[PDB]
Design a protein around this nucleic acid. Structure first.
Length: 48
DNA sequence: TGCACAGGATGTATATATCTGACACGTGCCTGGAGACTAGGGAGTAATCCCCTTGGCGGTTAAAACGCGGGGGACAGCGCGTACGTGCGTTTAAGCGGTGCTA
């Protein structure tokens, strides 16, 4: 929230995929404009 | 005249008996149990060294799964033609028991 007020663009790095999914649910619940890239993202999708 | 029955004739289901198979009881011999000797294979013991999961984990991939189109494979109907089913008359040789040999 503070960072958005400042207009910053923040990265979150985590070791666990399941928490990545939890983060998806969290960000959707707040509706932050977010994107995901992980060990399963398609290569072309990774580039784009 | 034709019927009733007195006197007599083949037959036969009923009844009494003779003509064939199988099981139990008697001999008697190659035995089965038993006694003792036997040892070396089995079983008890002890490493020992090697192969089998740890355990879930992400980042990947190859195979599995799921969805769809469609077109042709399966298949229920059925026209019809015949070649197996049922039923003769007729023949063969398969079955029966018998006699004599033998390998």
């Amino acid at each position: 929230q503070q960072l958005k007020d400042n207009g910053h663009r923040a990265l979150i790095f985590t070791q666990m995929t399941k928490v990545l999914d939890v983060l998806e649910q969290f960000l959707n619940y707040h509706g932050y404009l977010y994107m995901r890239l992980d060990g399963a993202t398609k290569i072309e999708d990774r580039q784009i």
